[PDB]
Amino acid sequence: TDIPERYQELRAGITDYGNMSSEDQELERNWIAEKISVDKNFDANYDLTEFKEAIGNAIKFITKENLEVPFIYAYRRNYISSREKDGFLLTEDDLWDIVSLDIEFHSLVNKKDYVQRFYAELHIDDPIVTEYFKNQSLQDIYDYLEFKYANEINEMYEKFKASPLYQAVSDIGISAEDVGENISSQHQIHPPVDHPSSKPVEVIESILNANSGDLQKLAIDTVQKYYSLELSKNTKIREKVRSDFSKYYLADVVLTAKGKKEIQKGSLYEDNRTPMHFRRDPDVFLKMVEAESLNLLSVKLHMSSQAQYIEHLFQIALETTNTSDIAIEWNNFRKLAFNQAMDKIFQDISQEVKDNLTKNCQKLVAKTVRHKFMTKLDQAPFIPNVRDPKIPKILSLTCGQGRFGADAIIAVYVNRKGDFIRDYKIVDNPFDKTNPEKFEDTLDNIIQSCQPNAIGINGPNPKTQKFYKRLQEVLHKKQIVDSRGHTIPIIYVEDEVAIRYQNSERAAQEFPNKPPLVKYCIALARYMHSPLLEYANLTSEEVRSLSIHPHQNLLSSEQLSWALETAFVDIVNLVSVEVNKATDNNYYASALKYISGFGKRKAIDFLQSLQRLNEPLLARQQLITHNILHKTIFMNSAGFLYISWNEDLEHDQLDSTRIHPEDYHLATKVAADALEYDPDTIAEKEEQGTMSEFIELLREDPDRRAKLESLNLESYAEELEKNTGLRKLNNLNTIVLELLDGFEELRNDFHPLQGDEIFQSLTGESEKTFFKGSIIPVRVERFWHNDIICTTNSEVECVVNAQRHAGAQLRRPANEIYEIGKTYPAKVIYIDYANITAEVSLLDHDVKYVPISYSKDPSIWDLKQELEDAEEERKLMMA
DSSP states (O other): OOSOHHHHHHTTSOSSTTOOOHHHHHHHHHHHHHHHHHHHTOOSOTTHHHHHHHHHHHHIIIIITOOOHHHHHHHSGGGGBOSSTTSOBOOHHHHHHHHHHHHHHHHHHHHHHHHHHHHHHHTOOOHHHHHHHHHOOHHHHHHHHHHHTTTTTTOOOTTTTTSTTHHHHHTTSSOHHHHHHHHHHTSOSSOOOOOOSOOHHHHHHHHHHHTTTTOOOHHHHHHHHHHHHHHHHOHHHHHHHHHHHHHHOBOOEEEOTTTTTTSTTOSGGGOOOOTTGGGTOHHHHHHHHHHHHTTSEEEOOBOTTHHHHHHHHHHTTTOOOOOSHHHHHHHHHHHHHHHHHHHHHHHHHHHHHHHHHHHHHHHHHHHHHHHHHHHHHOOOOOOSOSSSOOOOOEEEEEOTTSOTTSSOEEEEEEOTTOOEEEEEEEOSOTTOSSOHHHHHHHHHHHHHHHOOSEEEEOOSSTHHHHHHHHHHHHHHHHTOBOTTSSBOOEEEOOOHHHHHHHHSHHHHHHSTTSOHHHHHHHHHHHHHHOHHHHHHHSOHHHHHTSOSSTTGGGSOHHHHHHHHHHHHHHHHHHSOEEHHHHTTOHHHHGGGGGSTTOOHHHHHHHHHHHHHHOSOOOSTTHHHHTTSSOHHHHHHHTTTEEOOOOOOTTOOGGGGTTOOGGGHHHHHHHHHHHTTOOHHHHHHHHHHTOOHHHHHHHHHOSOHHHHHTTSOHHHHHHHHHHHHOOOOHHHHHHHHHHTTSSSOOOSOOOOOOOTHHHHHHHHOOOTTTSOSSEEEEEEEEEEOSSSEEEEOTTOOEEEEOSGGGTTTTSSSOGGGTOOSSSOEEEEEEEEETTTTEEEEEOSHHHHOOOOOOOOOOTTTSOHHHHHHHHHHHHHTTTO
């Protein structure tokens, strides 16, 4: 039970997880180190022993100490890095790779040992099988044993061999094992033996009538079908074919009935592919596999030289020089059984390599989706002032449907606490030329009443730009400034979460009698306060259906959910969680399940335990003294949870700092050194147990900077390791760093929406539809003094220049030319995402054609097939 929830739920499948030997541990270490070294791209030896040592330390911390990756990277960082800076470093990604490799390695060795425990279960000692298990295709070994010792395993071809027909196989003059040994040995150590006196046909014709009881050309077909099985079962052959196949196979796409029919060469399926090529575009293979799953196209996997690879492994191994017809007949039977067995094995080996690639690429895409979600999460709370930042007073509002003077503008005010105070409604039209001052006055009255510090806006359509511009100019006109004396900043903010929130039931129970716009503005404000909490609050299916990566749907729920969980774990462990708030601010506490060493089963227990205590925690030790936590859980998480300090003397500064309890003593000792206490007073105070006085004396003095930074971290850390043996330089650095000011913000600055993303979020037209130099139908709606004003399908404003439609090219205005109701195709020439406007050409000169195309190399892309199918495209209409 004292095991991290994520590890517990992961280990639910495997069994005997901790059962590993010294040889297993070394093989695992060297292998995982090789895998990471390969991805790290080292040069020469690179002092590889130090790297493999760091790997050993990491795997020890993970597998045996049950430490989660955040704690390891935070407090155990120095053991996973070169003593010299920039030598090497294993990132969070590497640690997650390590844990994944660890679990798969344990499951693999478990199956390997199970087959060992099945072979030795028979107690037979075979030169091949016993040698094979020396090192530790496993399923090949299982099939080999079930085929070879079908009866020895019974107490613990099958029918064909019972009939006399096996005499033909016996008469072959060489066993399949001889050929397999030659192949694996790469040389003909076992030449075949000639058959001198009887052809297979003589045996068949003689036996069929003479053995009317056991045997009856169906007999020959039966022999051909069953003998090749022995060829297909040889491990030494299959292993070599499989390996060579997986090194350079080709994966050209083959279409079906829907090919070029359901795609219309106008979709993502518009694409001799190779495994290495997928290293850059691994999603392409997912597209291929998905199209195959939906019965669109089937990717065919084959070797570079299938015919040469098979025959070159046969003429050198089985060709017969005997001119006797018997030898010719037998050699032909060898060739037929050989090639048929090869064709039989190819389907299985293909499925094996196919699934292997599917898994590898799924993980590779999971990595990128994770990293993007990560950069979405790492966003500090917005700061209203860089000079003197304080929590900001916020007033959120939404443009609505954009119908100024209608669909009354909704606004909401939220205090620094993040609590909904009051929603407003400005029905006065900001654009009514009659009395604009009406709107400007009522708005100023709102600001005067709430005195907010920031304004956020996001709407469904481009009208939001006009709304924002008006708001900005009105603010400038009224000279609205904070006590800071400068104008209130106005920023465009993301709203995806706000849209999901207002539709979500949680918002309904939170605000049962409020319109959707109010709840949306509320979510916008909250997003302005803490994006981490917002993303955390989303539910499993809703966050999964969040548009994070275009091909996110390719990954199944397990891989995507796991990848997302890793990001929440990292980012939550990047900034501490105030347990005091976590006991009651359920919205703020729900992130606890992602804190290091917590989860569903234990989050509930922890929260309930705090409720039972009915008092605020005063020191981290209380979590263990009252037995609230268990040793492992506390070790894995005590460094992240924190207590906010105030000012009662029993409380400790360290309880408001992200220092693990293990380094509290170190903190006091280094503070003592930074205080230049006399060695004798150090010993006396220590024997007296008066360490806490040191940090208070440090807090008292004003020359904190001049005294603290004077300390050389390197000397202290080197002496610490020399005397104690530990390695904590970076930890000591974090100590001294946080000893200045508690809980400095680590997340990067807020990310206001700028340009492109503004237009994208406010319009809903993808760059595949509305881009520089696109042809799109436009709705000519208004005529101007010289130009024409049109609109797109998503209310995008487009200007048709007098000359861009031959209006200025000829005489007279064109207003009489164009009419409403007819769809006019046009070509956009310029786009201004910042200004949300475009310039379009309405002339067939350009408006009258394949802007998109993948690779067209005849090998990468089959141009021959496309050219042949061009006649189908021509005839398809009449076909």
